[PDB]
Design a protein around this ligand. Structure first.
Ligand SMILES: C[S@@+](CC[C@H](N)C(=O)[O-])C[C@H]1O[C@@H](n2cnc3c(N)ncnc32)[C@H](O)[C@@H]1O
Lengths: 215, 25, 130
């Protein structure tokens, strides 16, 4: 397995079994040493204040978050960021249906859009009550992050001056979203509570509630 | 990139298939 | 006046899965050192030790059946027991139904066995050396 790259002669098959045995002993000791280290007790790359939640946003009850949010922060979110799995994938409608009006009273949004669903995002979040404002453009090849705002950002909380909208890849030929955007937020809201939907373990930064099926 | 577990899984499954052809003879 | 270190634990208790945060509320870094879907919960290590008494060392297929409802990895059992028996090769122990209290003795006796001959690594006695 694969059946065609495998040997069929006895001399070829015995030789291969002999080398696999040696190799299982090798990856055995690497797995004991891995588990023991993890066991007693290694530290992950995750910051301590991060707040992961593995759930499916269709199945997830947002009210459980809403209530536990008010219970602890005393306020709804300041900044919400998204990277919808456009159509592993979610029907364009499903994400549209998500109750993101409930989730934030006054603050910003950040939605990542590919050229194919660029227009869709605008009317997706104008539905969410957000007012389209600004576009952050990422150069790797282009991907656009659309920004919106509802209610009042007049409060002193937010900082009007913006880190330059443009942004670059931390590495060359990279596919994960770049970290700088988490400091754009940090300039825009320092130590503000933030939500990320469609998060990923490498999107785990502290101060951030991250919801993702892959967390 | 694979993990240590995933590699051991391929290795065992491979071992089973070859042991099957070594027994088929 | 919003304490984020307390706000983090206070959220993790009410929203995060049982695997992500300790009832303590702090973060369970053991969970992120293993890929998503291949983490080994403690409710799984007790499920295995239990399987050794009812089905013995060799019958992984049968154990995965009763304790893990057919979802666990036969080879991850095959290895996690080596760590229970502190030995790299468990061919000797094939088919022996071993009580949970006999396992620790078998581990301690194989670790100490390992320690003496300097054939011990990573709390595991390597009776097979390549
Ligand atoms: C393309 S990613 C976004 C990556 C993220 N921006 C990052 O930090 O790199 C979208 C992720 O959302 C997760 N996801 C997919 N379907 C989902 C669903 N129905 N509900 C919640 N999360 C989902 C998947 O893990 C998918 O990888």
């Amino acid at each position: 397995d694969y059946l065609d790259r495998l040997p069929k002669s006895k001399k070829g098959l015995q030789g291969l079994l002999q080398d696999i045995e040696k190799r299982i002993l090798h990856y055995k000791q690497l797995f004991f040493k891995e588990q023991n280290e993890i066991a007693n007790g290694k530290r992950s790359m995750v910051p301590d204040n991060s707040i992961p939640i593995c759930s499916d946003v269709t199945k997830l009850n947002f009210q459980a978050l809403i209530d536990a949010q008010m219970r602890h922060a005393g306020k709804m979110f300041d900044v919400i960021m998204m990277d919808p799995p456009w159509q592993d994938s979610l029907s364009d409608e499903k994400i549209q249906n998500m109750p993101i009006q409930s989730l934030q009273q006054d603050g910003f949004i950040f939605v990542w859009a590919i050229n194919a669903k660029y227009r869709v995002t605008i009317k997706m979040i104008e539905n969410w009550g957000y007012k389209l404002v600004d576009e952050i453009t990422w150069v790797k090849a282009k991907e656009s992050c659309l920004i919106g705002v509802k209610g009042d950002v007049d409060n002193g909380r937010f900082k009007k001056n913006i880190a330059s909208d443009v942004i670059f890849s931390e590495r060359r030929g990279q596919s994960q979203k770049p970290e700088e955007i988490y400091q754009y937020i940090n300039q825009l809201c320092p130590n503000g509570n933030y939500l990320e939907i469609f998060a990923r373990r490498n999107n785990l930064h502290d101060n951030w509630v991250s919801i993702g099926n892959e967390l | 990139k694979f993990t240590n577990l995933e590699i051991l899984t391929h290795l065992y499954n491979l071992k089973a298939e070859i042991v099957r052809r070594l027994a088929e003879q | 006046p919003l304490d984020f270190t307390q706000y983090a634990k206070n959220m993790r208790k009410d929203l995060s899965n049982q695997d992500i945060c300790l009832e303590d509320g702090a973060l369970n870094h053991s969970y992120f050192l293993t890929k998503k879907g291949q983490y080994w919960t403690p409710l799984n290590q007790k499920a295995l030790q239990r399987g050794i008494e009812l089905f013995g060392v060799g019958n992984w297929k049968e154990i995965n059946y009763d304790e893990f409802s057919g979802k666990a990895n036969i080879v991850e059992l095959e290895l996690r027991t080596c760590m229970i028996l502190g030995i790299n090769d468990i061919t000797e122990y094939y088919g022996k139904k071993i009580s949970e209290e006999e396992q620790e003795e078998i581990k301690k006796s194989n670790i100490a066995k390992g320690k003496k001959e300097n054939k011990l690594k990573d709390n595991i006695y390597q009776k097979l050396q390549q």
